[model samples]
Target: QPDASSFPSCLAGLQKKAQAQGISADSYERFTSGLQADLSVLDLLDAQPEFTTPLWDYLAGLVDEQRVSDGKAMLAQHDKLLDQVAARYGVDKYTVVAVWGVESDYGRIFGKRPLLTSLSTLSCYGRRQSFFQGEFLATLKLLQAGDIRDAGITGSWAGAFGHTQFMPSTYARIAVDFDGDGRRDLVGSVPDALGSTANYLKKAGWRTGQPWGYEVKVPADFPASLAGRGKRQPLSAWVARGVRRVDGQPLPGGDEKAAILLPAGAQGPAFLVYRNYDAIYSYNAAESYALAIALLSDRLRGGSGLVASWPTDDPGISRLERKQLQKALLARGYDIGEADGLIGTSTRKAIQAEQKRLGLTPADGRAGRKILEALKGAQP
Candidate 1:
């Protein structure tokens, strides 16, 4: 629980162990000397929206039309390159692009914290100090290896960086030099990043040309507890259980193992996820994250998105809608910093205040369709 006061002492202690992990003394010193404790990262470990937000809001924000359009543009922009990557790695191009889309928004946002600072801070002071210690050493090694040149390269609070957000360890083990540039520069080279993503998925058991999953209509009597990626069953078993594709067509993948996923509960959209979905889930442990990548990949493939509604009256808004909501809040004298779509603390506080005034139930700081529409009608 000690803060900055013990920071130097912690680094001194880590240097001994880091050197034991084969990190050079000079490299360790070079990385650690300028590092400061970003204790704020500790607070964020529990606040990740993937686990905290409702599934509907999480998917709405991640798999919106704006992202789909941008992803489609990206697919067209890098058609030849993606073709080469897919051919090489045996992973489909759309899933590769969807991973690019969900992680760092096609490389537009690489996060805000310097890797050394956040990793070192977590190494010194946090619940998983030992785990972060490894990442901290890995960061030092990457810097010393000349793959990641900038000491200031930023990423998520957890230390995953680059285009597809590879952790330092993952980068060391799995990143490939797809552009034939000698260095596996996932940050700077589109070919390297996208290719590395496909390679990672291939390692994670991605089946070439197999669907990640498809939305299905489960029987109303289906047990919610039976729905999970871990509870895989064959297509025949699911068909016997009264499961059918949402399109009312015959289910593909004869005898291929799949699991039921009712992300928004029994009344909402259900999916029969396959091994490819598990491969995506290994990229991020959360079910919502895998679903976002899956659904976005489907959209990129010219398939329509979910036919069933999420089990919510107040559905979440898209990024564009979030920007509109921010603008409305700004017009009403709220102090949110920008009309950028990100809903940070200030935006949520403002939303809570507005919700209270509008008599919206729960007064939760959710930027959903209800608030956006209410604000629209509230305009004088």
Candidate 2:
């Protein structure tokens, strides 16, 4: 048990770790003062429904009518600054706008917790301990360097902050002062946040004047095993395999190599992703998340939604791992109702909660490979 008895030792221990990391003693003590071991974060560990969801619903939540409207309005409202920033970073405004819209609803929901509290607690907790400690130290460095005020350092529970959700370490490296107020304030300055997000993507190798990726049609005989980021080939390679645009247009830029992306599966929609896609994928490290931004950007530019339907008939969770996942969840006490192959509301909610806990975005509560694999280490 993470009882109070260990609180002092844990606090003292972090102090030593902070010192070794070159954090100022004053900053460490001041930032971490009265910090308690937030052991209750454990309640979220096995708390959600375990199971999978469809790709269509996932994208719908992110790029829905309301989000599309809001993003369009935000784009119009911030057009001047967004254009300037987009021009400065060599990234398109709609793409930058899409990132901001998805990340925090144009900064309306910049997370509900203090960075000092969450990182400090996670640093002292079991899951990803070193990871959070480094973040905790980096956060202190940000405060000590006056990047942000100590008290204003609030963000996602996982330490991503501001309008575009840059992790604290990212803020240190890539954050910029687009407003020219002599400080890079992602939390308050729309330009700073937008600029920083673009800058991050640019640094991640965003191609100037390039589409991240686009939807495509694949032949039924398309080699499912040849799918994914690893089997990347030039557009002609895909064309030879009977791949074409959904609208029957010619594939853009034959020279650029792209990976096959069957977001749902071979039976579902298919896409050919490019390097710019990797830049966005690097933003949050989830393929679904990357696709959401891509599709959302398309919508912002007045493009239509997916022309292909999700293979709902497809067991998105795949009978491949269905019972195995249910058994694991039930064995670990997720209260998922049963070890049945189907994911109910209960199971979905449970998976969603775990995804949040594990810092999974597009936290859509699926018992897919990502969620199951993430929780596999925790035992009964």
Local accuracy of candidate 1 as per-residue lDDT tens digits, 81-192? 9999989999988999999999878999837788888898889886888899888888787788887888888998889898989889999889999988688888899999
Which candidate ranks first by TM-score, i.e. highest? 1
Model 1, global lDDT? 0.87
Q: Model 2 lDDT vs. the true structure?
A: 0.78
How does each model score on TM-score?
0.93, 0.79
Q: Model 2, stretches more than 4 Å misplaced? A: 16-22, 45-49, 150-152, 313-380
> Clash totals for all models, in order?
0, 9
> What tens digits encode model 2's per-residue C-alpha lDDT throughout 46-112?
4673444566545655676777889999988988998899789999998998898878878887366
lDDT of each: 0.87, 0.78
